[PDB]
Amino acid sequence: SYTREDIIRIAEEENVRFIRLQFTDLLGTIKNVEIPVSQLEKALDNKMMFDGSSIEGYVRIEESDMYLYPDLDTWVVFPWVTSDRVARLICDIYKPDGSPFAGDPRGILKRVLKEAEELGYTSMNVGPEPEFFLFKTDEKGDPTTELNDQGGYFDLAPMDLGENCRREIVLKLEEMGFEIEASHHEVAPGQHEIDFKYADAVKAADQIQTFKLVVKTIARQHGLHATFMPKPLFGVNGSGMHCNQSLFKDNENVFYDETDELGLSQTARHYMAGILKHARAMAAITNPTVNSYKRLVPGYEAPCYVAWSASNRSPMIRIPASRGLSTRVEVRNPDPAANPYLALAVMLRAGLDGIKRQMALPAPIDRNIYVMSEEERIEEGIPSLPADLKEALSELIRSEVISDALGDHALAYFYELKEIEWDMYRTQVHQWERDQYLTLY
Amino acid sequence: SYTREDIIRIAEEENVRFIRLQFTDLLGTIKNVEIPVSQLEKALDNKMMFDGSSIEGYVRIEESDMYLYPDLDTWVVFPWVTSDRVARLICDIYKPDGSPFAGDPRGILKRVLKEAEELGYTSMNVGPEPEFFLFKTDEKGDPTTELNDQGGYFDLAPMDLGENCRREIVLKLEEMGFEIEASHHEVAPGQHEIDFKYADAVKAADQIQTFKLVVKTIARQHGLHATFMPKPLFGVNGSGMHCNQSLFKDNENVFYDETDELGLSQTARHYMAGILKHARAMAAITNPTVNSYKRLVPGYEAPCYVAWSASNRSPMIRIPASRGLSTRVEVRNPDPAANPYLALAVMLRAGLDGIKRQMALPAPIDRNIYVMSEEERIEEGIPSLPADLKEALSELIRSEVISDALGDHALAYFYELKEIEWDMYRTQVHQWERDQYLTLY
Amino acid sequence: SYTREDIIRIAEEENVRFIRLQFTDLLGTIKNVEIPVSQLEKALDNKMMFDGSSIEGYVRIEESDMYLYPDLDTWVVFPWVTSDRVARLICDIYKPDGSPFAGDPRGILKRVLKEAEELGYTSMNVGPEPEFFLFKTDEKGDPTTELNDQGGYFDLAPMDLGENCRREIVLKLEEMGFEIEASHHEVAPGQHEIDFKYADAVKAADQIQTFKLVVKTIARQHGLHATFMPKPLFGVNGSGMHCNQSLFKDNENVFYDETDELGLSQTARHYMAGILKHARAMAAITNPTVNSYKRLVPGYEAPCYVAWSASNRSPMIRIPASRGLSTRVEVRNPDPAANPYLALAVMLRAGLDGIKRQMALPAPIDRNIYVMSEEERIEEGIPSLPADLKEALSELIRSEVISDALGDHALAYFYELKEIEWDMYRTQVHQWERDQYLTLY
Ligand SMILES: [Mg+2]
Ligand SMILES: [Mg+2]
Ligand SMILES: [Mg+2]
Ligand SMILES: [Mg+2]
Ligand SMILES: [Mg+2]
Ligand SMILES: [Mg+2]
């Protein structure tokens, strides 16, 4: 941990001159304030103010004044090998009267963790597996369509030192103290997955966000463009954020049970059942982009269906073979464009709803695959994820659990943002139409 | 502070070789004289002479001789990391007979501060929030139309070190001793806002001017073009230069009053009424360019209407939630192209007129927004700012307070400059006309 | 004249295969319907229907159905030297219930002529002098900035046969049966003026419309672009439509009076006074474009002032030396972009208002020119035309005569149209601003 005097002493020690008071909006894109070192004490006083309405995004209509409250435990200094070092602080947003802002994703996640703690579970161990694409840039600095390499799954194509981005990312994140479990080449050319070691929910989300920032910074440094867009190119597999989760009460993994046939406790079964039931509802927040539902198509490992299995090509919930303290539930649908705070919050809230209601877990699927008909698919009771973003929004509104989890104020603004996005998308005239048509009719 | 011997000692020890006897004209552009170190003593003697008529601008008809009187308290040295260091002095302009020149903006501001002091208020705490644009340059060194980045409001788009101008400018300004409250990305792509900590009026204006010079210089160093043009591109938000002002009387903020419902003293309300009544008159100076009134259009946060509110999308005056010694008056219409000396002078003079006349403050506007009709708009008593520069000039001439504040000599020359500018602008034939017409007629 | 059987017989003789049922909207642009010859009889039955709301322009909100009633006396056939010859018919617009449409400019002019006849004056002899610009086209067919020739005022620069458009226009208008008084080269390079012989008001307006159509058609044929935009290029003189007008009562020119000192009867003086008083009001309709008020600037023969003179550089009304049946009033301000029906209607309505009210004609101006001051300008009682479109619109609304002449329905739609145009124009950011600014600020 850290304290105010510790921060001041470290700033004096490291010659920190530049401070990034960080936070995030509902849209997920990293937001901040840049501060000189001479204001650091005032920063530690919980007194810095800013617009505040930026949380509502580009649809902000009325201005506010909102204060930044840093979390000292998240202090870190970037290793950018230059004089005038830069420091990072991750902050929460507070109203002028002192109460928390309802619409802050970190506030949402912490509220859901509080309501989890009230249920007796101390923490939620979360480990993500984000993948990113690197594209060669042009002379003006924009990404082109050609990838950085042409290797296959789990390859060594980015070898040597020439534009070896992956090694640089691993080393810088390690020097930042983040626990990197693995790093490797993913299915499509130019796709790199970075595995995190498991950590607490809030700090795991902070790890994901700082991961995105650092990966992009390094990519710009090597003359490449780093993108998390869930399906950048047609015909190649997209980017997934399989998240491994497990509940903890007093450093005890509640999911483990040697008496179970699969070694999964009843609490884990209720958790996964609750995740399954509200899956279509939570898709709108865990798959937030219009592009994301382009990735949920057959033939690219993408899980398009809601059923649980220990091992199958496309189930909603995968239960790994690791047991004991490492037994866990892997939810594979969410993608790197999704907000980690909101995604984890809705996952956990739906899971605790399932736990409280003691929902009956449906049977797992065998090696059986989903070439079956829709009549056969519904005969076995296997629903599917929403086809596109509009159905996801309608399901979100019709769902009374995750709407409560997001909160009344944030729900309206996120719904408005997604309505505007979808309205813009649906009225476009794409080139594919002019290819198919413009000659046939 | 500083003295003559201190200045000489600092120049000797710091190896200062180059001196900028610096001041401003009515047009606002930074003017100066370059001097070698060997004349520094003569510079400290208040004996340097120059044309003097440069204050009148490009319409000077008869030549004068006017002496530069430096203000030693504003001495500073530029840190450009090179041998043969350069030094800055901010000077006032004096007639050969010793009397002050009537047309100097700094002289105008100091005269208005003197007439404020005669009213019992010791000083005016002023903190600006200017914004500037970065445009990528071409091979020949001219600004192009494409911005440097594409981030949203309060973003972290300019990350890393590659052409990261925000960190470098903040650090250089801090090495000047500048009190930088914040620095962040603004609403449009490529728009950067720098927040200053509060300071005295004359020092605040000097801070704004040296701030502009510093930002433009650093942009040149990074191969970028820095502009304050109030509306550089159609369809994007322009530049705002909100000034937060508050009267100080012997380390006492006269505006604060715990007995008030909103925490504004009667003197504060008189200030509000005085600024509101003469708003249309002062717009001609605080919005000097023809382009500025292109920014005062609906839909881009631009306040187009004269009414006061604690929180609204577009009122004349915003009163922040901060209270106590930090209660303030944020006037939002003035833009960075406006001369800070003249803008602050006219604001304070109109406000002091309101204070003396004890003008009755009209009611604030609620969350009600301004889709309401013009007949209703005048029914509710909500006037609007002048549509363009010509009406602003006519209102300025018809106003008997602001014309007095600028002074008889300076008023004529400012009016002549703006008449020439508007006459040049109105007779042009722009490309938009040839787009709409040249085919329809 | 002509009749139904005459039209059918001529169509049989000339092998007319293509009919243009012509008309005009409030915008002035030529509109029509194309019909095959086999429907010609139905066309002569006044039974053809169309949208009708096209008269309101692009601001049409509710759809109608309106019938075309041709005027057989305006039948004419184009001499385009090709098989499958084409014929022209000029039509009025009628409601489905049989009543005239209020918003038709031809209907407006005919109503004003009817109210003139009710005053005892049989007709209005009108002869225009429109000028047009010819620009060289590029490869894709768009006009460039370079003119066709570089001759001076009244020149022979467009000589020979190579792209000698003026002769072609004169010859085709003569085969049209239109009476061409003269044709010559105008002040700026590339400007050709075509003088019409005098005709009745409605037929004169039809002559102007078909004149524009034929000139543009010929220019497209010669690989040139014909434009009537009043001030296409800065620094060159604009395009004017000096209109000569005189009232006729039973082939007797009421204006002539040998007893008058200058040979103008009291009726002519009242007419001129009525035109003078409502000049500012009628400018918005006789100078409709935003570009037109760019032409009303000093130094290019453009009349910018409301005063009458027999001979001066820039009076509102010019009285030529020709007398007897050739006495006339020449109104010089209206431009070729202005609707001829509307301009003639408002001119005549204001003139008859002056005649009825017996307005006292102010004194004429001598060779005195208008380098005199604004204080002098108002001292002599010489008003000026509105500076731009917005002032013209406000004056038009404040006027109770011209608004009545246009009619209640048409006034609202024209006002809305011009408000939209001016609103679009005022919020643009032109290149001239980025030239002056973007470096100075
Ligand atoms: Mg993977
Ligand atoms: Mg996995
Ligand atoms: Mg701002
Ligand atoms: Mg502000
Ligand atoms: Mg002419
Ligand atoms: Mg003439």
Side-chain angles (χ1 to χ4, degrees), chain A residues 50-66:
Chain A
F50 77 114
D51 196 334
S53 296
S54 307
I55 299 296
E56 283 74 358
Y58 48 82
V59 301
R60 50 182 302 264
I61 189 65
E62 57 94 13
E63 297 74 8
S64 62
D65 279 320
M66 262 195 178

mmCIF file of all heavy atoms in Angstrom, chain A residues 50-66:
data_model
loop_
_atom_site.group_PDB
_atom_site.id
_atom_site.type_symbol
_atom_site.label_atom_id
_atom_site.label_comp_id
_atom_site.label_asym_id
_atom_site.label_seq_id
_atom_site.Cartn_x
_atom_site.Cartn_y
_atom_site.Cartn_z
ATOM 1 N N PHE A 50 -13.370 19.034 -11.998
ATOM 2 C CA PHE A 50 -13.452 19.038 -13.452
ATOM 3 C C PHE A 50 -14.927 19.041 -13.843
ATOM 4 O O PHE A 50 -15.816 19.176 -12.993
ATOM 5 C CB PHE A 50 -12.684 17.852 -14.052
ATOM 6 C CG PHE A 50 -13.411 16.543 -13.954
ATOM 7 C CD1 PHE A 50 -13.844 15.893 -15.093
ATOM 8 C CD2 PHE A 50 -13.665 15.963 -12.728
ATOM 9 C CE1 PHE A 50 -14.514 14.691 -15.008
ATOM 10 C CE2 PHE A 50 -14.336 14.763 -12.638
ATOM 11 C CZ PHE A 50 -14.759 14.126 -13.779
ATOM 12 N N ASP A 51 -15.179 18.877 -15.145
ATOM 13 C CA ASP A 51 -16.526 19.011 -15.688
ATOM 14 C C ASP A 51 -17.498 18.054 -15.008
ATOM 15 O O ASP A 51 -18.587 18.452 -14.583
ATOM 16 C CB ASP A 51 -16.500 18.762 -17.195
ATOM 17 C CG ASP A 51 -17.748 19.255 -17.893
ATOM 18 O OD1 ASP A 51 -18.815 19.328 -17.256
ATOM 19 O OD2 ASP A 51 -17.668 19.563 -19.097
ATOM 20 N N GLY A 52 -17.122 16.783 -14.903
ATOM 21 C CA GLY A 52 -17.979 15.768 -14.336
ATOM 22 C C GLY A 52 -18.996 15.196 -15.302
ATOM 23 O O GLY A 52 -19.176 13.977 -15.346
ATOM 24 N N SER A 53 -19.649 16.048 -16.092
ATOM 25 C CA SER A 53 -20.609 15.575 -17.080
ATOM 26 C C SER A 53 -19.954 14.768 -18.191
ATOM 27 O O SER A 53 -20.666 14.115 -18.962
ATOM 28 C CB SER A 53 -21.369 16.759 -17.676
ATOM 29 O OG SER A 53 -22.137 17.414 -16.684
ATOM 30 N N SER A 54 -18.623 14.786 -18.283
ATOM 31 C CA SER A 54 -17.927 13.969 -19.266
ATOM 32 C C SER A 54 -18.252 12.492 -19.113
ATOM 33 O O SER A 54 -18.139 11.739 -20.087
ATOM 34 C CB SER A 54 -16.421 14.173 -19.143
ATOM 35 O OG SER A 54 -16.092 15.545 -19.206
ATOM 36 N N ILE A 55 -18.650 12.062 -17.913
ATOM 37 C CA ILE A 55 -19.041 10.672 -17.708
ATOM 38 C C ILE A 55 -20.224 10.309 -18.591
ATOM 39 O O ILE A 55 -20.296 9.195 -19.120
ATOM 40 C CB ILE A 55 -19.347 10.419 -16.221
ATOM 41 C CG1 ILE A 55 -18.109 10.695 -15.375
ATOM 42 C CG2 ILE A 55 -19.801 8.992 -16.006
ATOM 43 C CD1 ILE A 55 -16.964 9.755 -15.672
ATOM 44 N N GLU A 56 -21.160 11.237 -18.780
ATOM 45 C CA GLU A 56 -22.291 10.963 -19.654
ATOM 46 C C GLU A 56 -21.898 10.902 -21.123
ATOM 47 O O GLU A 56 -22.727 10.508 -21.949
ATOM 48 C CB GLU A 56 -23.375 12.016 -19.438
ATOM 49 C CG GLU A 56 -24.186 11.817 -18.166
ATOM 50 C CD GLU A 56 -23.435 12.190 -16.905
ATOM 51 O OE1 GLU A 56 -22.250 12.567 -16.999
ATOM 52 O OE2 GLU A 56 -24.035 12.110 -15.816
ATOM 53 N N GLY A 57 -20.668 11.280 -21.465
ATOM 54 C CA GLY A 57 -20.181 11.168 -22.826
ATOM 55 C C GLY A 57 -20.407 12.400 -23.677
ATOM 56 O O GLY A 57 -20.335 13.530 -23.185
ATOM 57 N N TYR A 58 -20.679 12.194 -24.964
ATOM 58 C CA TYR A 58 -20.937 13.284 -25.894
ATOM 59 C C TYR A 58 -22.390 13.739 -25.880
ATOM 60 O O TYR A 58 -22.743 14.671 -26.611
ATOM 61 C CB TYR A 58 -20.517 12.883 -27.314
ATOM 62 C CG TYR A 58 -21.016 11.529 -27.780
ATOM 63 C CD1 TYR A 58 -22.301 11.373 -28.284
ATOM 64 C CD2 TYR A 58 -20.191 10.413 -27.738
ATOM 65 C CE1 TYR A 58 -22.755 10.136 -28.718
ATOM 66 C CE2 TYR A 58 -20.637 9.174 -28.168
ATOM 67 C CZ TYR A 58 -21.920 9.041 -28.657
ATOM 68 O OH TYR A 58 -22.365 7.812 -29.086
ATOM 69 N N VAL A 59 -23.236 13.112 -25.065
ATOM 70 C CA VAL A 59 -24.637 13.491 -24.938
ATOM 71 C C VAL A 59 -24.879 14.355 -23.708
ATOM 72 O O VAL A 59 -26.033 14.557 -23.314
ATOM 73 C CB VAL A 59 -25.550 12.255 -24.927
ATOM 74 C CG1 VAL A 59 -25.365 11.452 -26.200
ATOM 75 C CG2 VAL A 59 -25.264 11.397 -23.704
ATOM 76 N N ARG A 60 -23.819 14.871 -23.089
ATOM 77 C CA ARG A 60 -23.979 15.742 -21.934
ATOM 78 C C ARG A 60 -24.708 17.019 -22.330
ATOM 79 O O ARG A 60 -24.356 17.680 -23.310
ATOM 80 C CB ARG A 60 -22.611 16.065 -21.336
ATOM 81 C CG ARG A 60 -21.604 16.544 -22.365
ATOM 82 C CD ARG A 60 -20.241 16.813 -21.755
ATOM 83 N NE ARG A 60 -20.298 17.793 -20.679
ATOM 84 C CZ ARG A 60 -20.041 19.083 -20.833
ATOM 85 N NH1 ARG A 60 -19.766 19.594 -22.021
ATOM 86 N NH2 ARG A 60 -20.063 19.880 -19.771
ATOM 87 N N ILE A 61 -25.742 17.358 -21.564
ATOM 88 C CA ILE A 61 -26.595 18.496 -21.860
ATOM 89 C C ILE A 61 -26.461 19.593 -20.810
ATOM 90 O O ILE A 61 -26.554 20.778 -21.136
ATOM 91 C CB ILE A 61 -28.068 18.055 -22.020
ATOM 92 C CG1 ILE A 61 -28.920 19.213 -22.544
ATOM 93 C CG2 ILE A 61 -28.627 17.498 -20.714
ATOM 94 C CD1 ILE A 61 -28.546 19.665 -23.938
ATOM 95 N N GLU A 62 -26.244 19.225 -19.550
ATOM 96 C CA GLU A 62 -26.111 20.202 -18.480
ATOM 97 C C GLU A 62 -24.792 19.975 -17.757
ATOM 98 O O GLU A 62 -24.403 18.840 -17.474
ATOM 99 C CB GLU A 62 -27.307 20.141 -17.510
ATOM 100 C CG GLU A 62 -27.571 18.784 -16.865
ATOM 101 C CD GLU A 62 -26.919 18.635 -15.504
ATOM 102 O OE1 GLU A 62 -26.467 19.654 -14.943
ATOM 103 O OE2 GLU A 62 -26.874 17.500 -14.987
ATOM 104 N N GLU A 63 -24.104 21.077 -17.470
ATOM 105 C CA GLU A 63 -22.770 21.006 -16.894
ATOM 106 C C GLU A 63 -22.839 20.828 -15.385
ATOM 107 O O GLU A 63 -23.769 21.305 -14.729
ATOM 108 C CB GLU A 63 -21.973 22.265 -17.231
ATOM 109 C CG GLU A 63 -21.722 22.484 -18.711
ATOM 110 C CD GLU A 63 -22.951 22.948 -19.461
ATOM 111 O OE1 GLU A 63 -23.973 23.248 -18.811
ATOM 112 O OE2 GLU A 63 -22.892 23.011 -20.702
ATOM 113 N N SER A 64 -21.847 20.139 -14.841
ATOM 114 C CA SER A 64 -21.687 19.942 -13.412
ATOM 115 C C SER A 64 -20.284 20.370 -12.991
ATOM 116 O O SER A 64 -19.508 20.920 -13.776
ATOM 117 C CB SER A 64 -21.954 18.482 -13.046
ATOM 118 O OG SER A 64 -21.026 17.621 -13.686
ATOM 119 N N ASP A 65 -19.971 20.121 -11.724
ATOM 120 C CA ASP A 65 -18.619 20.251 -11.196
ATOM 121 C C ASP A 65 -18.370 19.038 -10.320
ATOM 122 O O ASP A 65 -19.127 18.793 -9.376
ATOM 123 C CB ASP A 65 -18.447 21.542 -10.391
ATOM 124 C CG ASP A 65 -18.203 22.748 -11.270
ATOM 125 O OD1 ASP A 65 -17.463 22.618 -12.267
ATOM 126 O OD2 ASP A 65 -18.749 23.827 -10.962
ATOM 127 N N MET A 66 -17.332 18.269 -10.631
ATOM 128 C CA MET A 66 -17.156 17.004 -9.939
ATOM 129 C C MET A 66 -15.698 16.837 -9.548
ATOM 130 O O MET A 66 -14.790 17.207 -10.291
ATOM 131 C CB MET A 66 -17.646 15.850 -10.811
ATOM 132 C CG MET A 66 -19.046 15.434 -10.430
ATOM 133 S SD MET A 66 -19.629 13.852 -11.039
ATOM 134 C CE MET A 66 -21.240 13.846 -10.264
#
